[PDB]
Design a protein around this nucleic acid. Structure first.
Ligand code: ZN
Ligand code: ZN
Ligand code: ZN
Ligand code: ZN
Ligand code: ZN
Ligand code: ZN
Lengths: 836, 836
DNA sequence: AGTGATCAGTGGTTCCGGAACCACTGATCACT
DNA sequence: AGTGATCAGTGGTTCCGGAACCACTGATCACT
């Protein structure tokens, strides 16, 4: 059986009609913009999700004709849990299995002395008696109250047992036995208690190991790990400005120490002798939104003073397995956790219960390794995971949940993944497939393309040049006759990415020293300037930590004298050799309808002035503003410049319809009359970057921003192509162009976080190109990449590792691609060998 | 492959572990209470839904260990669309295909004169010219302005065409041609216009046939069909009581016609001369929640004065196909609509476009027939469909949507279905299966059980007697060795339901005459009294209409002098032969935690008094109230009687935990000390109906209500079994017992709407039994049923039909089962033959 | 000349709680 | 004796809108 799309014309799709094989690893490929995400995500996923949800208890319809074989679909991608209560543990369901394990095996200790607790059955004490006492001894059985009094004979077994038990009933689980002869006394408990102090540990159940249960969570943090401590970002007195009388009362006591109308001893205003600003705003928090107000403004979430950030109460933290309480265990990297579960030797009475439990835990602990997250710890906040880390956890969870019958759609799951781990991701993708799921992956990575069960190539190119199936079938087929597609060619060899054959050398260098932020091993980084630098290393090695959470803020402050948070470090040297810093991370473009490529990269400004220079617009009052659809005056006022009004009808969601006044041109007739070389302002939003780049050859300032958009490959996009309809690789690329178009000083530092995300072989080519051009002008470019085609072109490389997590944070290697490719201390080098 | 439940212990499930075959028609069967709904719905569906939804963009966990092979699951059952905009058409997606059809073919007429509109191409008029005019004529081509002036020669074809076109450009689609020789003039339009009046019909598109589009809906009702007309349920002046000054102004003008402080001429207060109460409260509606206030209270939704309730604007209503505008078409029963589409003979140029469209519409129009809803019309409000009608529409839609890979779980889909249509439902169930879905049906119907690909029988009996797989495998297997289950036996023949062999005769009769409510053909029903009556007939025949929406309210008013709405009719006769009327419809029990069987059927009252009679409770102040957990005094005040407190934690949903004070017994220690025959009040909520029925043999009033619960089969339920945890066949049965326990007059009328819903062969037996016992005491019992085992036992039958919809509403037949089984004018009789 | 650092105005996101309404319990009144 | 027709108190359902917050456009100022 197979999935059968027919009449697919979403976005730029050209009414295509493709048969996708069910239960296979299908990779959909294509140059960024081609619209293969519009087929994977906005058609297939979007309909399989729809058809399902609308069959439930309902509280858009993707433009397709029909789709046979469609199944409930799930999209996996970069989507953070947001709430403070999610750990890697909880999110993968693994923590729960753990909560049961610690419940079943694992001994409680004393919540204060740490001494292992003790309890005995009536079996165990009846047996104690016959060891400590001589058969024939006359004994008393008490209840802390005479219960029985007899002779310790084997013949009296049940009498003893009956009385032993009764003694615990009345004794509240406590029974005393006296050796009437010797005077020796023995007190016992059918329940857990400390020998050194006599306190009764709680009821051992999974609920106790749950920092999301009243039974498990810490008393003064509710299992969150942190509390809400007011922060001296409260200083006129910033949090008092909703009642002037407040500000005055303290001013009157200030004038009582002899001051008007900041002078030393500010410590009083802040604490008191009476009531300080701090404890007062802290009291307002307890004694009460306006609870929300003070959370956003004056409050910093600090670690829980009591549990230490361990979330669990004092008791739960006292149950141990081979020395580790459940939290301690979740702190081991998921691979240490694994071995711990293995070098675990439990009595066979124990290994009889745990048994399968223990296997169930290890099976999905592995799915985490198999996806390359073996460096994480379950204790890890879901909150603080990269997008790629999130993406691969959903993959492991979903393959763990063993759900079957669905169509999974993944967008570029190699994001954040070293070339070294690609092998294992493909192996997990195929496993998620062998549960009997259709796995559809939008990817650009060759290794993944080569492992596809079926490929579908969309193009030829972006925008109107896409929406067509330029190839479909097997890998062998595509490599047997590749003349058919740009993807086929980059695999065949026809097109390739050139290793610039001459390395560059610096003119100065940057030296950030003693970098201790996160897992970075108190390192000393020297960054060559005026060269193309790369930062590589396996996931978890510390790339983002160093480059983006330390190096970046730090320069921003030594350059803009600003107060940005940054990673721990000792010093920076030679920062005067750069005089501006531009950064482009992976975050998403702000999407409004009031925005298109032209307005976003600002070229439209220059174009608005050109139109306001036309004799006709000079003849009238017209200036540049007349030509903005976001400004009253020359836009269409029916639809406020939108090109559509909003029709309000009863009992239905609002529906937007074309503006009948302006026809959706979104300008008033008068403005549409001003023309340059024959076209009005609306006509100019209809042309592609390539079209506009021609039209404007002679207008230098315009042609420039345009050229950039063309150079990054975006040359095929409509200027007015609204921001919302923008694809991911475009939007990133526009955000890219928006920065790359501001003239450079010749000594600016460009920081790029995985710039090749959402980029095809082809787009990457134009990219490394543009980047080379940037350094020639004496500019420094740092990129964090796992993409080998971008790494071959660096003149310097700083390789972090050797592994991820706590087993990384080391500069394992540095030098040119070549110096790195000979270094056997580096994985990056081990793969950089087969491209040099 | 197969689904594999392991460690299933939801509700009364006994930790069972069943393998269900994937892609099969699986019927799960069992005596009502057995907990087979807890496995179908609360385990399988509940998890397949969960695992899916939690994989999406999340904004309980059914107690099971593991479930392999699980797929996204969908439950189909009695669940109304609630909104005023849903029709059968829209809900099945069929209307949309229709909107396209009327767009593609189907001629517009004049929105007022009804004269078919006309337009011509430049091709059509160029050709007209050469017919009307003699080749050689000199002509002028105008624009309503001389465009051209030439000679009508074939040699001038393009000149004419070019000018013809230009003439329409400037002419606004209008071109005039003069025969300069003859004086004859011809005006043409490239667009639709009326020859008799010259108005331009709108842009013909699907959006125009959409009463949910600004383009399609009616102007003064927005495609809803009705408006909001204030109703004289406004009379001190009920809608003026939020401003006394109002009531006074009118009182001062009343005292100006000479009245204080109702006297004839009330018409003024209501309308004015100045402003009446009605137009004013009507003005408050337009000129403005408090819009909501007046909707609930003083306003009645009346039909739209303009569109007539047709929803569509005047234009859309003017496009016709073979004489019918799109609404007219949706009024035909889905089977007339079908034939209409067939006896439709469209020109081959037409049948080339519509072609597949027309087939796509007919395919799913059939799924409606195949499920037995051929009697409906697309125009039918989704709002006013029975639960069973809803259920089978989702089935047709879902089989229409061709979705595949999911597990469908249906609860008793024969609800509302005549025995005659069961054949076709099974055929649809198997079709929904052959798309490659697992179809799991909780059913009791033998015909469906016999068509199962795989059966799973749960029991032995209800409550603690269930939760076990008492058989699984094929139909043949079960009938080859049936000694294994109560279901197996009712098929084998071992157990059977006896046709009471002696019919009863009335002592009087009820005669409701001229019943015209809904589709009932102005009929005259005579109801025999003191006998067991049944009302039968195919879905849509009018059973609910007659018995429940006319007969019922009508008696309620002639008995309670109340003002209930009722179906249209002329008169009632002999209503004095009954002096009380009890009714039990299919609606659901109000579910609170403050309720159990014992409190619901009120027996717990009698039990509370017994406990307040105990010497110990007499010795103290205690009365009956002390023994209610819903009253302050003797319940547990920690948990307000709930048996659990609510723990509020941060950032997580509330979690309820056992009350540590009362241990979940929900009474304070003092009360728990009063005992009767050795058990406190809590202990008595723990015992089953059968247990309690023993315990209380000698307490007559108690034993009675209990006996009822035992007689309907409910003898196995915990008295304190909370209302929420109640199954459907139980809850209905409790609601049943709650009425059947009030002593009868000996002349009360009992009306039961499908009382055998959610009932097993076995429960039906105990039911017809109880019902017989009720008539012996001279009581009249009317039941609406399709269940043949209940119908064999009637002494009279009133068969409605012969079909559903407008082709029903006739009393096709009456008499005893036998008199009916010989009547070939009746389907009921045609199946009642094989059980007599 | 081109910038960045601003500000107003505007759109997208997201992240929650109440009011009204209806059903059940368990009491009394007004009775058969 | 047991009812139904009441009423208060309480729980379940359901059916919605704003405020705050953040991003983008496109202007001016203060400059290189
Ligand atoms: Zn201790
Ligand atoms: Zn804490
Ligand atoms: Zn407009
Ligand atoms: Zn007309
Ligand atoms: Zn209307
Ligand atoms: Zn309690």
């Amino acid at each position: 059986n197979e999935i059968v799309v027919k009449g697919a014309r979403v976005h730029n799709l050209k009414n295509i009609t493709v048969r996708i094989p069910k239960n296979r690893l299908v990779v959909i490929t294509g140059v960024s913009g081609s619209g293969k995400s519009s087929l994977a995500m906005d058609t297939i996923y979007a309909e399989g999700q729809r058809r399902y949800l609308e069959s439930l208890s309902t509280y858009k319809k993707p433009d397709v004709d029909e789709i046979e074989g469609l199944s409930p679909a799930i999209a996996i991608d970069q989507k953070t849990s947001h709430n403070p209560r999610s750990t890697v543990g909880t999110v993968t369901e693994i923590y729960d299995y753990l909560r049961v394990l610690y419940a079943r095996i694992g001994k409680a200790h004393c919540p204060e002395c740490g001494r292992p607790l003790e309890k005995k059955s009536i079996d165990e004490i009846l047996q104690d008696l016959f060891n400590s006492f001589k058969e024939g001894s006359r004994i008393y059985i008490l209840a802390p109250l005479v219960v029985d009094r007899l002779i310790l004979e084997t013949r009296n077994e049940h009498r003893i047992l009956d009385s032993l038990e009764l003694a615990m009933r009345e004794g509240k689980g406590f029974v005393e036995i006296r050796n009437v002869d010797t005077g020796e006394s023995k007190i016992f408990s059918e329940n857990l208690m400390c020998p050194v102090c006599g306190i009764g540990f709680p009821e051992i159940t999974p609920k106790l190991f749950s920092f999301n249960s009243p039974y498990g969570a810490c008393p003064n943090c509710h299992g969150l790990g942190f509390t809400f401590e007011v922060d001296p970002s409260l200083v006129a007195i910033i949090p008092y400005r909703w009642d002037r009388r407040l500000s005055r009362w303290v001013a009157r006591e200030i004038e009582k120490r002899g001051v008007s109308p900041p002078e030393d001893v500010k410590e009083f205003i802040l604490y008191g002798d009476f009531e300080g600003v701090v404890p007062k705003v802290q009291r307002w928090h307890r004694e009460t939104e306006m609870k929300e107000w003070l959370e956003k403004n004056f409050i910093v979430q600090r670690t829980c003073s009591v549990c230490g950030g361990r979330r669990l109460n004092r008791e739960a933290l006292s149950v141990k397995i081979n020395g580790l309480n459940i939290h301690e265990f979740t702190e081991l990297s998921i691979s240490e956790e694994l071995e711990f579960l293995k070098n675990l030797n439990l009595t066979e009475r124990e290994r009889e219960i745990v048994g399968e439990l223990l296997k169930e835990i290890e099976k999905r602990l592995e799915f985490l390794v198999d996806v390359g997250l073996e460096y994480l710890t379950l204790s890890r906040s879901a909150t603080t995971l990269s997008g790629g880390e999130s993406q691969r956890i959903r993959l492991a969870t979903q393959i763990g949940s063993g759900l079957t019958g669905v169509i999974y759609v993944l967008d570029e799951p190699t994001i954040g993944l070293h070339p070294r781990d690609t092998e294992r991701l493909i192996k997990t993708l195929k496993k998620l497939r062998d549960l009997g799921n259709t796995v559809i992956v939008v990817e650009h990575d060759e290794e993944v393309i080569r492992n596809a069960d079926h490929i579908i190539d969309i193009g030829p190119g972006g925008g109107t040049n896409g929406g067509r199936v330029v190839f479909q079938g097997t890998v062998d087929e595509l490599l047997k006759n590749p003349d058919s597609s740009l993807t086929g060619e980059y695999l065949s060899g026809k097109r390739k990415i050139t290793v610039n054959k001459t390395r560059r050398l610096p003119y100065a260098s940057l030296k950030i020293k003693g970098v201790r932020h996160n897992n970075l091993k108190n390192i000393d980084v020297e960054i060559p300037l005026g060269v193309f630098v790369c930062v590589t290393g396996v996931s978890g090695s510390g790339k983002s930590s160093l480059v983006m959470e330390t190096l970046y803020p730090a320069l921003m402050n030594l350059l803009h004298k600003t107060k940005l948070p940054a990673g721990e470090f000792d010093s920076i040297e030679g920062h005067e050799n750069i005089d501006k810093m531009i950064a482009i991370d992976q975050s998403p473009i702000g999407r409004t309808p009031r925005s298109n490529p032209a307005t976003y990269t600002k070229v439209f400004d220059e174009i608005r002035s050109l139109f306001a220079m036309t004799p006709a617009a000079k003849a009238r009052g017209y200036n540049k503003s007349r030509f903005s659809f976001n400004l009253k005056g020359g836009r269409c006022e029916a639809c406020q410049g939108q090109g559509y009004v909003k029709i309000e009808m009863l009992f239905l969601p609002d529906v937007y319809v074309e503006c009948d006044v302006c026809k959706g041109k979104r300008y008033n007739r008068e403005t549409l009359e001003i023309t340059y070389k024959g076209k009005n302002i609306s006509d100019i939003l209809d042309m592609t970057v390539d079209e506009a780049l021609e039209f404007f050859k002679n207008i230098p300032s315009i042609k420039r921003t345009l050229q950039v958009l063309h150079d990054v490959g975006l040359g095929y996009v409509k200027l007015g192509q609204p921001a919302t309809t923008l694809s991911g690789g475009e939007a990133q690329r526009i955000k890219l162009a928006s920065e790359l178009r501001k003239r450079d000083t010749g000594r600016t530092l460009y920081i790029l976080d995985e710039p090749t995300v959402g980029l095809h072989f082809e787009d990457v080519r134009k990219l490394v190109e543009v980047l080379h051009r940037l350094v020639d002008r004496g500019n420094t470019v740092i990129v964090i990449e796992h993409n080998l085609d971008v790494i071959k072109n660096a003149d310097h490389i700083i390789d972090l590792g050797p592994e991820g997590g706590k087993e990384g944070g080391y500069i394992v290697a540095t030098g040119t691609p070549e110096e790195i490719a000979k270094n056997p201390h580096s994985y990056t080098g081990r793969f950089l060998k087969n491209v040099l």
